[PDB]
Each structure stands twice: as structure tokens, then as C-alpha cells.
Symmetry: C3
């Protein structure tokens, strides 16, 4: 009835899936386990991508500091824009020709900020302001369109949430079979699966 140990006449979610041998059970126990791993991974992997979209700040840091720059506080705003520009260049879409355009455009943005700071370190106020307004040519030229990376990520992350919700429900259904070999298979899968993909984000 209610937390049995068995391998006989156990239906599994779909009408075609039924198990009457122990060899069929290990198949079901390996699948339910892998679903439990895939799940806790899915959840982490989905967050990792969400935290990577950092860029949303970097991008708005550059554009908020330019609006702040447009009165010798400019050099500090530009220091904030320099750090933002570097972590932004590291970025890459989720797994090379467009990327080489995007990354090579960011090389300039650093140098242009160094020059407008080289004026501002000497004492030059209005000349760095005009040099800052030349950055708006460059960021528009290369980076502003490749915003595509951002949209692609949210859509990918919607699609992941969808699947994450189904897979959750599926693991509830298998747990509701009340079959301790399956229930354990899931629980142990959730236990280990989390550990492995936890170890992988710590590597990154």
C-alpha cells in the first residue's frame, strides 16, 4: 500500500511503463535517479545563467556613468566605467566570428577611457568630456547590438524553467508510486546530483 518494497506490477507514470522483474526495476531506478540528478543540475545551471546576466549592470554602469559625466568628478565615473568594460568583454553566449567583433570592440573602450583619464589626471576638464562623447560612437558601433546575447539568455532560461517544472512534477509522481526503491533512487539522485553540480559552479 504505503511505502512498499517491490518490483511486481509497479506502473511508472505512463500506461506502457510497468515493471514486473528486478532487472526492470534497476532500469527504472537508474532513470528516476538520473532524472533526480538532471533536475538538481537544471536548477543550478539555470541560476548560473541568471547570475551571469552582471552584464545587465556592466552595460547600465557604462551608460549611467556617461550620463553622469555629461566638475572634476568625471575621472572617478570613468574608473567605474573601466572595470565595467573588462568584465563585460569576458562574457560569451551559452554553449566565434561575432564574438571576435564584440571582444575586439571592447579593447578600444578601455584605451579610450585611459586617454580621457590621462587628460583628467593632468587636470583637463572639458577635453575629457568631449573624449567621453567619442565613446558613444564606439559602443554603438560594436557592442550595443551584441543585447542579442541578453535576449537569447532570458529566452533560454524561460525554456529551462518550463522543463524544470515538468521534471519536478515527474519526480513527484514517481515518489507517489510509494515504492521505496524508486523513492530512494530519486532522493539519492537529488542528494548526489546537487553535490556534483555544486562542485562545478565552484570550479567556475
Amino acid at each position: 500500500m504505503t511505502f512498499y518494497f517491490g518490483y511486481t506490477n509497479v506502473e511508472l507514470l505512463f500506461a506502457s511503463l510497468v515493471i514486473n522483474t528486478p532487472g526492470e526495476m534497476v532500469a527504472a531506478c537508474f532513470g528516476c535517479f538520473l532524472l533526480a540528478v538532471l533536475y538538481e543540475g537544471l536548477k543550478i545551471g539555470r541560476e548560473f545563467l541568471l547570475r551571469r546576466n552582471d552584464l545587465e549592470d556592466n552595460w547600465e554602469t557604462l551608460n549611467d556613468n556617461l550620463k553622469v559625466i555629461e566638475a572634476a568628478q568625471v575621472k572617478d565615473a570613468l574608473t567605474k566605467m573601466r572595470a565595467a568594460a573588462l568584465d563585460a568583454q569576458k562574457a560569451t553566449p551559452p554553449k566565434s566570428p561575432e564574438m571576435k567583433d564584440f571582444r575586439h570592440g571592447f579593447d578600444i573602450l578601455v584605451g579610450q577611457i585611459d586617454d580621457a583619464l590621462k587628460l583628467a589626471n593632468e587636470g583637463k576638464v572639458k577635453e575629457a568630456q568631449a573624449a567621453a562623447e567619442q565613446l558613444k560612437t564606439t559602443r554603438n558601433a560594436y557592442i550595443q547590438k551584441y543585447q542579442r546575447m541578453l535576449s537569447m539568455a532570458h529566452l533560454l532560461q524561460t525554456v529551462l524553467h518550463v522543463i524544470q517544472v515538468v521534471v519536478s512534477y515527474f519526480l513527484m509522481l514517481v515518489f507517489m508510486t510509494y515504492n521505496a526503491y524508486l523513492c530512494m533512487a530519486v532522493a539519492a539522485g537529488a542528494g548526489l546530483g546537487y553535490f556534483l553540480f555544486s562542485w562545478k559552479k565552484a570550479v567556475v
Copy 2:
């Protein structure tokens, strides 16, 4: 038995709710769908409020920097207090007479910090310290009580969690009916619902 497609003799959570026509099914499928949307919204909307309580930092930033100020490092602590004071003024309770008192009090706090920095930019140490101690009159006068905004938010967010837990369980029960029209209705609702309220926080 087990992932059927049907509209005949399907009970739905409560003894009174049973469906024997396809027209009753779409009613059940629209409700289960809307519950799936309302849910993924509830979750996001509940986090949005939690992240808005920022203020808990702004407030403790002001009060930690005053304790830091009470030796020409004061002007920097006051710069941190200026930024804190502005984002704090933007704030508003979850959906005007008390707000106009709260926001108009914050106008002073900015000006008072500008004056105690206008002393500290000229070189005046002990005079800015005494001007800083005049801020403790103002923040107590207007802002310190309206702390109410904070308590109202956590209580609202408790009440949301409560409902969020029930609604979760209800969606599990409907999924457990094993009726593919309902199961899909939920899953598709979770899929889309997330997308819409995801799009709404990106607007904010």
C-alpha cells in the same frame, strides 16, 4: 489510470468539483492554467518585494556612517550617506499624505550632507562633525518612524508565502489527477506565466 486523456468523471480537488463534459474541462483547464500563472507570478512578485527591502541597507548605511563619523575621512562616509539618502527617498509602500512627509524630509538630509561636505571640502574637520550631529534631529523627526514601511512589507510577504505554499500544493493535486489536459494546462501556465511576470520585473 495513468496519464489519460479524458473529460469524464474527473474529480478536481473538492467533492463538489467533478467534470463530465468537454465544456466543463476547458473551464477546469483555464482555472488550472490561471492558477499556474498566478503561482509563478506570486513567486516573482514576492521576491521583488523582498529585494526592495535595499532600504534595510540604505537605513543601516546612514546609521553606520554616522557612527563612523562620530580625522578627515568623514567626507567619504558622507558621500556614501548621500547616495543612500537618494535611493531611500525613491521608496514607497506596496499598492500619499505620509509619503509627502517622508519624501520632503529626505530633501533636507541631502542638503544637510552637502553643507557638511562643503565644510569638509574646504578643510574644516570639527565643524562638519557637529553638522553631522544635526542630521540626527532630522532623520528622527521624519524618516525613523516611516520602519513602518519595513514591517508592513515583511508581514505582507509572510501572507504571500502562506498563499504561495497552498497554491503550490493545489497545483500538485491537480497534476496528480493524471489527466493530460489538466497537466498540460498547469505546465503551459507555469511556462507562460513565468515569461510574463519575468518581462514585468525587467520593465521595472
Copy 3:
């Protein structure tokens, strides 16, 4: 059938657990309630520990700033290293001889940073760089091994997730009994339990 109020012939997860008296029901209702409290606590308590591992930044802030220091920008990097060193010393493993070694080692790290800033405030460039390289003796001597605190925490947090997943599933099973006294017991437990452990992190 389907959201009944009853205390007669209600099995509860395990074959041995069955209830036929109202006195047995309150026992089941108190246990299901406490499981609902323990749960929402478990979730919060598990996050609290995760957010405490701050240290992972403090540690990498010190080691990234030393690499940055190895040209009178060093004094600022050292200011960042000073703040990092203090919040790092506060830290403690989850509930005294090793701790007294760890905390007393951090006293030096602050003083050593103050001295290498006392050189850098006077104008001395290369002397503070060599004084910074003396910090690498001290952090290795005491703090770098006690990294143990970090590993102990992730392993503890794996073990918590495991139990958190089981307890979730168990609360689903009791809710699936469709017995309104149990269902309420859980829901009310989740409602209150969250409030109490929410109140406890706000105390910390």
C-alpha cells in the same frame, strides 16, 4: 474521497502509522505541523549558511589585491584588504582552540596593512610593496588552512539539501492524504514556521 474531514482509517506514509481516534489525529496534526515548521526553517537556515560563505569573497579579495599590488594605487588596494580582513575575523564554524589561533592571526593582518599604509600615506612606494610581501608569510601561517571552515560548510549544506528534499516529499505525501486536518496542519505550519525563522535571521 477528496478533501474529507476525518479521523478514521487514515493511513500516514508508513504501514504502521494509521489513525482511528481524534487523539491520534492531534498527534498526527502536531507532527505534520512540526515537519512543516522544521521544513521552512531548514530552507532558511540552509540559505543563511550559504550567504555566510562573504568569506569566499573576503579571502579572494585579499589574494586578488595582493596580486594587484605586486604606481601609488597600492594604498587603495590595501584599504579594500583592511575591510576584508575584519569581516573575515568575525567568522566562526557552524554550531574554541583553533578559533583563537585563527582570530589572533587576523589581528596582525590588520596591523601589517596599517603599517604598509603608513608608508604609502607618507609617499613611500617600493617599501609598502615589500611590506605587502611580508603579509604572505602571515596569512599562510594561520588563516590559509583554517579553507577547512569552507569545506565543512559546503558538506554540511549538502547534507541539509538532502534532508530538505526528503522532508519536502514527505509533506507532499501527507498533503496527498487529502485529509483537511493534516492539510491545514501542514499549511499553517509552513505559514508560522516561515515567520519565526524569518524573525530569527532579522535578529542576526
